[PDB]
Every structure is written in C-alpha cells, then in structure tokens.
Amino acid sequence: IQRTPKIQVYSRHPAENGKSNFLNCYVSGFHPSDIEVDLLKNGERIEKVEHSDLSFSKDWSFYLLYYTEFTPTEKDEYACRVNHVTLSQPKIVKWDRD
Amino acid sequence: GADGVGKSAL
Amino acid sequence: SHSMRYFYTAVSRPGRGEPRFIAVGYVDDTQFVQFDSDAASPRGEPRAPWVEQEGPEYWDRETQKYKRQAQTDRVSLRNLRGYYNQSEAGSHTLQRMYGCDLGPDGRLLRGYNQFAYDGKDYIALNEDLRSWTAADKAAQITQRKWEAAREAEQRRAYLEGTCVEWLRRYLENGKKTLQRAEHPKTHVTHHPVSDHEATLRCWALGFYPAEITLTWQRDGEDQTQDTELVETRPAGDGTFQKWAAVVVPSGEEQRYTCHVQHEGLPEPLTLRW
C-alpha cells in the first residue's frame, strides 16, 4: 500500500525582500521512501540544496525536509518539484509567501 | 545510545 | 515527560546492490544521531551539540551497533520475502521504532519495540516487555523464533535500563536545548477571496516542542468542520510552525477568534482580526 506525499513550501522566517532566509520544501506522509525533490528558482533547479535525514511518523509514513539559503526579492518566483511512485507526473508546488 | 546486544533477525 | 526514540529503515533494491539501512535517533522532537549504510565511510554521525562532546569510544561503539544492524536487516528482508512468497524482483521496506518514555517522575513509563513491513504493522513488543503481538501469519513465524530465542528478555533489559540511562544523560548534557520551551509567535493574516469572502489564517511560528493546538472560534463556538489545518512542519532551525485557516463573509472578520495552546505560553492566546 502506497501513500502520496503531502507537500508544503514555505520560508523559515516571514519573507522580507532583500533579507537572507531559508526556503523549505517539507514532504511528509509518503510510502515507500524513494522520492525526488527539487527546489526551483524562476523555473530552474537550485543547486546545493540540503535535506534532513529520512525519518518516519507513528503511522510509519516518511517525512523529509529539503532546504536552501535564499534572499527573497519582489521579482523572483520559487517552487518545489516532487516525484514519487504515487504521482502520475511530477508535482510542482509554488512558494506562496502567505 | 542504540540497542546493540544480540541479533534481532526477523 | 520525555522520550528517546530510534527509527530504522531498510529498503531492498533487487539488481541494484544490497539493501540500504538508515537510522535516526531523537530525544523528544530533537534529532541527535544519523547513520546511513550507503555513505562513503558509514559512521554514526552527531546531529545535536550535546552528543558531539562524547568521546571516541562512544562514537565507535554506536557505529559498530549500526553496522551490525544493517547486516541483520539484510537477512531479515530475505526471510520476510520468503515468508510471504514474494517475487525477488520487488523492492520491500522494513521499519523499526523503539525507545522509552519517561514519566513526570523521571521513571520509565513505557518501553516500545515494534516493526512494520511494507509500511504495515508486523510485530510489536507488548507493554509488559515479555510477550509479542504478531499482526499476521508470517509474523507468527518471527514471534515463535523470538520466543525460542528469549528475544524479549534482551529487549526488556535495554528498554528498562540502558535506554533510560542514556535518556537521562542526554537530558542533562543537553538541558539548554532539550529542557526549554519556546512559545509560538502568533499572528493572523487576511486574504480576500472575492468582494464577498476572505480567508483568515492563524499562524504559530518558532515554537518548541512540536505539540500545539490551534482553533478558530466564531462568536464563541468552535469551527472544527470548517477549519483548514496543515500538518505541523519544521522551520529547519529546531523549531516548528503551523497554521489554521477559515473562509469568512466579508464584513464579519471581527466575529472570529483564533485560540493557541502551547506549553511555552504564559497563558492561552486569543487573536482577533
């Protein structure tokens, strides 16, 4: 039995233009554990993204945090792209500062 | 500190 | 109350090498150790400052434990595939969670040691720490094997003694990290959906530990069946975030209140747009 990931994209601190921050993509509730996660800036894959160590919840489903340092601006768009066996195609979730 | 004594093979 | 918990994951990959084994350990909501069998030089690695100061003997012994566990989980995965008559082409997952809960008196409240196969309960040590609950016929094979081996006695010795001693040591050495509470910083945001409706989103940011309650009320009555609630998420700096939202008639925003409960607050918060 497979479980589809829940995906949240958000910043570590409330977003202030020109202030350094961290961009997070939290994936949780999925099974099996194999999953692909990229952070995007203006549609392009961000390099040197880091992630937490694979863990799981009381219901045995996995969760992972992907993150990178970034300085948000008025102009730049960001997103998280996730692929998993439960998805018919990659799912892109846009960063909505709210 | 992890649980290391013995061999817990299913 | 406090807890120490270990989470093991082993995943087979037929045709692509031996199974990968991952272990992480937590005190309460704070990770302190990781191991990955696929790392270039696999070693137990610190993830919290209050274990980085342990000496080389501690880290060598932990590393050796994980290496043995990775090797044991390879045989467990082979055994399991056989019990279930599964094809050798498929990838399968074995998970283990074990650890100890301390009560308010600092004494062992409950020990646990349970297993899942392909994400489904397989076998668990009962609360008495002497007998097993098997979830299906295949797990009864493991139960009989562990009864014969007196496996529960070994796990009980860890859960009642070793596990508690480690937890108390970590709570003391990491007290500035582990024995604090950071209260949530809270605020309401307002997002028009149309001229006629708006969503009110109640935020809790920067709090530790992760347990928290957020609720929307309307003229005093709670709005459970109409509240959108996201799962509590890590900020990435050791603290957590959560929000709860309702969609409200334009001009009635003032009738709603958000209520936050967290052990770090000096009193429950009420927020009104």
C167 with C246, same domain: the answer is no
Please give the interface size between B and C, counted as residue pairs whose CB atoms are below 8 Å apart: 52
C89 with C78, same domain: the answer is yes
Total domains in chain C come to: 2
C117 with C202, same domain: the answer is no
- Most B CBs within 10 A among C24, C58, C72, hence the mutation to make, goes to C72
Return the bridge partners of C215, or none: C259
To the nearest whole angstrom, how far is the Cα of B9 from the nearest Cα of chain C?
5
Domain final residue pick, C180, C200, C228: C180
**What is the CB neighbour count within 10 angstroms for residue C103?**
11
Identity (one letter) of the amino acid at C179? Q
C93 with C168, same domain: the answer is yes
DSSP assignment letter at A41? E
Q: Which chain C residues are Cβ-neighbours of B1 within 8 angstroms?
A: 58, 62, 162-163, 165-166
Pairing between β-strand C213-218 and β-strand C197-207 as defined by DSSP bridges: unpaired
Q: Which of A16, A60, A28 is nearest to C210 (CA)?
A: A28
Verify B-A touch: 3 or more CB pairs within 8 A. Answer: no
Q: Do A24 and C235 touch (CB under 8 A)?
A: yes
Contact C259, C268 (CB under 8 A): yes
Q: Do C162 and B3 touch (CB under 8 A)?
A: yes
Return the bridge partners of A44, or none: A41
C161 with C205, same domain: the answer is no
Phi, psi of C50, deg, nearest 5: -85, 0
To the nearest whole angstrom, how far is the Cα of A84 from the nearest Cα of chain C?
14
CA torsion through residues C174, C239, B2, C133, sign: positive
C163 with C211, same domain: the answer is no
DSSP assignment letter at A15? -
Contact A25, A95 (CB under 8 A): no
Burial string for C69-101 (b: 16+ CB within 10 Å, else e) reads bbebbbebbbbbbebeeeeeeebbbbbbbbbbb
C90 with C166, same domain: the answer is yes
Dihedral (Cα; C162, C163, C165, C169), 10-degree rounding: 130
Pairing between β-strand A6-11 and β-strand C228-229 as defined by DSSP bridges: unpaired
C8 with C117, same domain: the answer is yes
Q: Does C136 touch chain B (CB under 8 A)?
A: no
C211 with C167, same domain: the answer is no
C12 with C112, same domain: the answer is yes
DSSP assignment letter at B10? -
Q: Which of A30, A41, A92, A97 is nearest to C231 (CA)?
A: A30
Alpha-carbon distance of A53 to A30, in angstroms, equals 15
Alpha-carbon distance of C113 to C124, in angstroms, equals 6
Tell me the CA distances in angstroms from C81 to A42, C78, C94, C172, one per residue in order: 45, 5, 11, 43
Give all domains of chain A, ordered by start, each with its CATH number.
Answer: 1-98 (2.60.40.10)
Report residue C65 as tokens: 């434990």
Domain final residue pick, C180, C201, C218: C180
Q: Which residues contact C93 (CB under 8 A, 6 or more apart)?
A: A31, A32, A33, C9, C10, C11, C12, C116, C117, C118, C119
Phi, psi of C58, deg, nearest 5: -55, -50
Find the CATH number of the domain harbouring C106. Answer: 3.30.500.10
Q: Which of C76, C98, C166 sits opposite B1 (nearest CB)?
A: C166
Find the CATH number of the domain harbouring C238. Answer: 2.60.40.10
Q: Edge-to-edge strands of the sheet including A91-94?
A: A44-45, A36-41, A78-83, A91-94
- Structural domain boundaries enclosing C39: 1-180
Q: Which of C262, C263, C211 is nearest to C232 (CA)?
A: C211
Q: Which of C9, C31, C231 sits opposite A6 (nearest CB)?
A: C231
Q: Which residues contact C211 (CB under 8 A, 6 or more apart)?
A: C262, C263
Domain final residue pick, C180, C204, C230: C180
Structure determined via: X-ray
Q: Which residues contact A88 (CB under 8 A, 6 or more apart)?
A: none
Please, which residues 211-230 of chain C have a Cβ atom closer than 8 Å to chain A? 230
SS3 A20: coil
Report residue C180 as tokens: 């604090």
Tell me the CA distances in angstroms from A82 to A79, A89, C81, one per residue in order: 10, 9, 30
Q: Does C110 touch chain A (CB under 8 A)?
A: no
Phi, psi of C152, deg, nearest 5: -60, -35
- Most A CBs within 10 A among C13, C22, C37, C211, hence the mutation to make, goes to C22
Q: Which residue of chain C comes nearest to B7, CA vs CA?
A: C72
Contact A65, A25 (CB under 8 A): yes
When computed from its CA atoms, the radius of gyration of chain A, rounded to whole angstroms, is 14
Alpha-carbon distance of C213 to C127, in angstroms, equals 29
Q: Which residue of chain A comes nearest to C201, CA vs CA?
A: A98
Contact A94, A77 (CB under 8 A): yes
| CA atoms within 13 A of residue C141's CA, in its CB half-sphere | 11
Tokens 């094979």 belong to residue: C141
Question: CA-based angle C136:C138:C139, to the nearest 5?
Answer: 65
Q: Does C109 touch chain A (CB under 8 A)?
A: no
Which chains neighbour A (Cβ–Cβ under 8 Å, 3 or more pairs)?
Answer: C
Q: Do C231 and A8 touch (CB under 8 A)?
A: yes
Report residue C98 as tokens: 């074990």
To the nearest whole angstrom, how far is the Cα of A85 from the nearest Cα of chain C?
12
Burial string for C224-236 (b: 16+ CB within 10 Å, else e) reads eeebeebebbbbb
Q: What is the DSSP string of chain C?
A: -EEEEEEEEEE--TTS-SPEEEEEEEETTEEEEEEETTSSS---EE-SHHHHTS-HHHHHHHHHHHHHHHHHHHHHHHHHHHHHT--TTS--EEEEEEEEEE-TTSSEEEEEEEEEETTEEEEEE-TTSS-EEESSHHHHHHHHHHHHHTHHHHHHHIIIIIHHHHHHHHHHHTHHHHT--BPPEEEEEEEESSSSEEEEEEEEEEEBSS--EEEEEETTEE-GGG-EEPPPEE-SSS-EEEEEEEEEETT-GGGEEEEEE-TTSSS-EEEE-
C76 with C115, same domain: the answer is yes
Tell me the CA distances in angstroms from A74 to A31, A70, A97, C184, one per residue in order: 36, 13, 11, 27
Residue C184 burial class via C-beta count within 10 angstroms: exposed 0-12, middle 13-18, buried 19 and up: buried
Return the bridge partners of C124, or none: C114, C133
Peptide bond into C209 cis (omega under 30): yes
Alpha-carbon distance of C154 to C129, in angstroms, equals 10
Alpha-carbon distance of C176 to C99, in angstroms, equals 22
To the nearest whole angstrom, how far is the Cα of A42 from the nearest Cα of chain C?
23
C115 with C99, same domain: the answer is yes
